[model samples]
Each structure stands twice: as C-alpha cells, then as structure tokens.
Target: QSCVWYGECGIAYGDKRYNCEYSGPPKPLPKDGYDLVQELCPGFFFGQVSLCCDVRQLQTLKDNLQLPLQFLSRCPSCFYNLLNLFCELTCSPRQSQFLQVTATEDYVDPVTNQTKTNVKELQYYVGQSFANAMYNACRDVEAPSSNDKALGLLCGKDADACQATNWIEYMFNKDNGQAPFTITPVFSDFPVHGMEPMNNATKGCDESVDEVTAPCSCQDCSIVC
Candidate 1:
C-alpha cells in the first residue's frame, strides 16, 4: 500500500521506515490551488487534509464539474501520485522535488538491508498536496493543466519542477527503511522526552503509520520496538 509522511529525518542521508497510511492524515491541498483556500477553510494553513480522497473530492466538487472517471482511476487514482509526494517530503527533506523520482517494482531498502516485495511495489502516487487538492476540487470535468487546480498547486506562480512521485526510495518514511515498519514519538505531543508507540496503533495490520520520524538520537527506530 502507498503511504504518506510529514517531517524530515534527523540524520543526513539516514534511512527510515514509513508507517505507510500510518502517518497522521496526509497534508491537504491549498485552497484555489494557492492561498484562495484561506477564504474557504479560513484557518486552513499547513497540516490538515489526511486522505488523498479528501483533497480529490474538493476538486470534483468545484472546477471540474464534467469529468468523472478523470478524477477516479484508470490504473490508479490521483491520490496515488499525491501520497507519493507526501512520502517524498517525509523521507528526503532536502531532495529537490523538481526532479521527481520514477517509481518501480524494485525499491531497495537501505535499513532492513533487503528489497521490497511485489505487494510493496508502488504503481503510482500523488506528488503534492496541491495535486490532491486539485483532484478533489476538480474531480468532475477535465481541466487543462494551465487552469487545473492540481496543476496550479505545483506550477502555480511559484511551482517547482522537481516534485517526483518516486524520489530516493521511500518518500519521507519515518521508519528505518523497512518494507513494513512503525515509528512513533514516545509523547503524544512534542516538547517531551519519550517515544511511546500508540498502544495497538496498528489495528490488525490495518493501522496507519506515524508521520514524524524519530530524531537521530532516537537510537531505536521501531515505534513498538
């Protein structure tokens, strides 16, 4: 399954694991593909929308009022791309997004010291919160990239050209670069000195992952470890 992330690693070039859908809700797309959302969401700033669908549905309700399948999925939905971007920022904080990484079935793990299985292969994922928000706001009709909400998020007045779905392995993965791992800060909130894993945060193999990765001083990387 594809995953989402929020923060950067503590160590330079350090490998980590992404709890996959475990991190808190993924970042939401900005309003109007820019700051226009301020008018709609008001307090909507950074950190909000969790699922890619949340952002995708927004576009479907707005701009694209005619395209349906376009927002849905051919091989994968728009979220597929957005989730990837979410992971990218979470993994390689300094990796230039303008140069997107092409995903494949052969992703190597730097920590677990192994290769990912086919089920672990990511066929597609979203590139940015903007892409997802655009998909949400324009999931009905097909809008040209120039005017598309998703397109605007990445290429708006200040869009970057390097946001890739597949950049440097796992995008912003908080784990130790394992195919499937969990990482959680000991405290419920920041400004503390603990790394307690949420009790049974993983509900029968379906639990989502932690967003923020452990600091380099964390020593152990597993959330429940």
Candidate 2:
C-alpha cells in the first residue's frame, strides 16, 4: 500500500480523460545510497513527478513555444518547489520520525532566525495551499527510477501506478493540432483556500494499517500515443 493523505489528487491524460482518487507512497525507500522512505516520506518519492519535472520535455516545450530562450526556464524549479510545498502543507507531521524532526526544526527556525541543515521552511497551511491545488490539476509524464539509472523517468515501467497516466500534453498544452502552443493549466477547484480539510486530509501511507488510505485508482503513460 502507498501513503496517501487527505483527499484524492486528480490525474489528467490525453483528450480530457481524467481521474480523481486518493494518493500514497509510490515505492519503498532506496537502500544503496542514503534515501528517505517512499510511502513514509512527506513529498512524492524523490524521482516521482511529485519531486521533480522532466528537464528534457520542459526544454522541448520551451523551444516549441517560440518564446524567448529563458521564457519557461524557471518551470523546472517551480515544479520542484510546487511538489515540496505540497508535502510541507498536506503531509501529516506525525506520520514519520524523519518528517517530524524536520517539522520540529522548522518550528525552531522561525524563533531562532537560524536555518538548520536539511530543514526547509515549513509553512504548513499558513495561508494558501499552492502545491496541493496545483497537483490536483497537474499531470506528470515521467516517474523516477532508482534500480536502473541514478534517477530516471520511465513512463510505462515506473514503479508508481499513480504516475501511469500522462497528462503532459493537455495540462501544459493542447494535444490536438489546433493550439499546440497555448499553455493553460486546467483550473477549477484550485488554489485550495481552506486549511482545515486539506490539512486534516493528510494521513499515513500503509497497507497494513486499515485506517491508512492507499491509491484507489490511477494510470500510466501507456496508451494510443
């Protein structure tokens, strides 16, 4: 079972096909080099679209857009920050000891004015849930791989089933030949404003635990592409 907290995050795919279901840890922790537990960790597994976006695809889109060279340059980092922000806000602090420690450090940093190592700014449901809202509408085309490459994205073969669906085309651009360059992120129930339900939605990821919620439904990139 995967670790999913709160409400289900929506997944989008080709031609307006979509799904809204629960989420959880996509894989287990890496043992070779030091790594955080997948299901237990706060954010999406490091390689999962939850942590990073594809530099290759982003650049291709940038080139296709016919904008200035650096027009969409910040997208990769913005996507990274968005995923981190999702975990910081929606992940329950009590789920894992590692995350709890970081939360504790995050608490101390504000009063002491000294940023500690490996402790990111914890703004849990402070005002708006940017990452939470974005993830609901965003679609990731790649999922990270640890066993094969250092860190890689393999669409159909990725470990995470939730990442099976690929919405990279429509979420960022029109799939049909009509408007390939128009980048409009589908927005409806976005920019989550309420902090309580969203914050409370955060839960632990585990199949053993009856109360913990795992992904009910999801897909990959394998389709008539």
Candidate 3:
C-alpha cells in the first residue's frame, strides 16, 4: 500500500481541479519500522511528512483567486529527505542496523543552536495515526524501479495506479535540514499551487539531478512560464 497521508476523498480529481487532493489523517506505522523490541533499541527510526499542494490550488487558497506565478509551499530539500529513508522503507526493510538507532528527540544543530523539522512534515492528523500505518506497511518493499529513476517522474505504466504526474513536475524539498542540506534536491515541485496535477512534461531527457541546483529555496514559479 502507498504511504497515504490524507483521508480518502472519493473525489480523486474534482472541483475546479485546482486543489491538491488533501491527504487524510496520518496513518499507522509499518510493523517492521515499529516494534515491541524496545528492550533492544527501539527509538531509532522515525518519520515525518509534508504536503504537495497543487501550485494553482495554493494560489487560490492563498489569494482567494488565481494569481499568476503563484506556487505552493516550497523547500529545497523535501524530496532528498523522502528518498533518504522512506524510499528505503520500501526498497530495503532488512537494513536494520542503521534503521533501528535511537532517534534524536528531534534533529538539532547543537553548535548552531538551531533545530530541523521532521523531513516529512505533511499536514497529518493529531497523534499521527496515519503515520503509524506507514510504519506498519513499509516493509512490503515494492521497488517499482519507476521511483528510482534518479530523474523526472514516471506514471508506472498504470494511470489509475501512479499518483505521480511526473517527478520533474513536482520536486520534494527539505524544510527542516540545516543551511546547505536544508532543501538540496535539484529537481523542483510544481511552482503553482492548487491546480490539477499535470502530467510530466519533461520526457525523454537524460537530465541530471544537479541541473537545477542553486539558491536552495522556493517561491512561486508556476506562472513563470
């Protein structure tokens, strides 16, 4: 099962088609990720979440109308963080030595006197029940290969199954990491918020993940076209 973060809305593609389908309340953790084995060392693994708001929807949500060039929440490191551990959740569930370490109460830079946010900080429900579901199911290990392209997104040859419109279209950025690594992925998410999720536009190109590496920040770039 995919790591769903929202309540199921029967309406997958609805409304003016400008908003991102809201992920329902948080989910349960995968069984392997969580355990009663605390006697050994139980606190190491943890997860966080973030939202991929349709850039157009964000504009509407923000300005109460469409604002050209508007974008949803942006961060440079969102995707890299997702790829860091979550991807491994499905890719390598058995690599537990590093998986089951004692998690820091939170990611903090003791020297800088700063704290980092959970990488996966989506709008989850209180108590993180949805997140718990993720912990429980993550060990299934469905490496679609489609997700590991190291580049833009692919629909996984199943329109109904692949929720991703394209990887290049929507980049994941890190909101909590420190300066250089805070949001470091070179790919960028759709800049406009609250619009129908568009299909991937960058096709058949051997683009490097480092192409768009720069300022390491985000702002509305959807309407920039």
Candidate 4:
C-alpha cells in the first residue's frame, strides 16, 4: 500500500538495500494544499491533480521561492509560466516517470543516529517544445534593476547573449556541468513513461480570464494588453 515511486521518499537508497517510509501512494493534495498551490501557480493545468509534496514540504517550497516569486510577480505571464514549471516538477503525479534519481548519499541523523539516504542528483525529462515556450514567455520580460531582460539574470548572460542560447542551456547552463540536476529536453516522439511535458495554453499577458489576471504592464513587457 506504500508508494514506491523511484525517487519518492528516498526509495533509491544508493546501496543494494532499499529503504523508505511506508507512506501511502501519491494522492490528490488536500484542499489547503491545493489553495496554496493555486496561489503560487494560478491557472495551472494540473492544479487539482497535484500530488507530490505534503503540506509541510509545500510550505518549505514556498519559503524557498519567495525571492523569485517577488521578483516575477509584476510579470504575471512570465511568472505563471515559471510557476507552472516548478509546480509540475515538484508536485506532478507523473514525477516518478520524468524525474530520475541519479545519485544518492547516506548520512547519519544527529538526533536519532539513524542512517538516512538523500537524493543527490536527478535527471528531469521535459519536452523540447515546452522548454522553448517557457523560455520564450520570459525572454522579453524586463529586469528594471539591471536594464536588461529577466532571462539575462537567469542565464548569467546579457540579454543578447541569452537570445542566442537554447532553453536548456539558458535556464540550467547544462553545458557548464555545474547544475546539480539535469534537464533532458526530448525532441522526438520518444516515450517518457507516457508523461507529457506541462504546457501553457491558457491566457497569456494579453488576456485575462476568471482564473488568471495579466499583471505585466506595457512598460515591462511589449505583449501586455
């Protein structure tokens, strides 16, 4: 009855031995959890199906996202696209298929002196078109502080330089071999465990719907309406 997804709850113990807490299989998030996710990722396609993080982990994720959330808040379209990426990556039911546990390490707990395994590296499979759309959504977003596009700061390069780079290298600098996780963008009709990449097909910065509000101003984004 316990959920034994590849990377969930540290199932991949690194050694020959397998260890994990006997938690139930991944299920729909609680109402409050859904609300929290909705607040962070408005108009998310998988909002109702989010099932990965527990309530506590969701709070921690929110805490870790404060900086980026605040910075991207002004450009809702770009922010929404980015939040969709995080939401799917962290809470998608299909995470086991797309997220592979590449490495793990054992550590001793200071309080209980129990050995525990931690996932050290992961490989995330995404669709090339999805990656391109996500990057394109934010490519022109203005970063007022630096007089540059938001992608420039994200890619550690000037806006012009970022324009020449692909989405994977722009977002993760995969070529540098410094990112802790790997993002594999699939181009062909290959099977990724029957999981499709999360796509943004709803209203963009130019449109507002009941569930979404366009927040990007004309000054910050040319597409604002």
lDDT tens per residue, model 4, 150-199: 66566656667764235455444334333333344443224556644445
Residue pair clashes in candidate 4: none
For model 2, residues 78-162, the per-residue Cα lDDT tens digits are 2333334333433333222112111212212456575323222122222133334333322322323212310112122232432
Candidate 1 vs. truth: CA RMSD?
Answer: 20.3
Scored against the true structure, residue 122 in model 2 reaches a CA lDDT of 22
Give per-model TM-scores: 0.17, 0.20, 0.17, 0.69
Candidate 4 off by > 4 Å: 1-24, 28-35, 41-50, 163-196, 200-203, 209-212
Candidate 3's residue-wise lDDT over 10-112, tens digit each? 1212232111122243333444423321211222244432222122322322232111112111212222222222232212222221111121123445688
Model 2: which ten-residue window has the lowest total lDDT? 200-209
Candidate 1 lDDT, 6-77, residue by residue in tens = 322122223322222222334445444433233222222355433222333333223321222243222122
Which one is best on lDDT?
A: 4
lDDT of 3: 0.23
Worst 10 residues of 4 by lDDT: 13-22
The regions of model 3 sitting more than 4 angstroms off are: 1-73, 100-209, 218-225
Rank list by lDDT: 4, 1, 2, 3
Best candidate according to TM-score: 4
* Candidate rank order under TM-score: 4, 2, 3, 1
Model 1 error, position 36 (Å) = 28
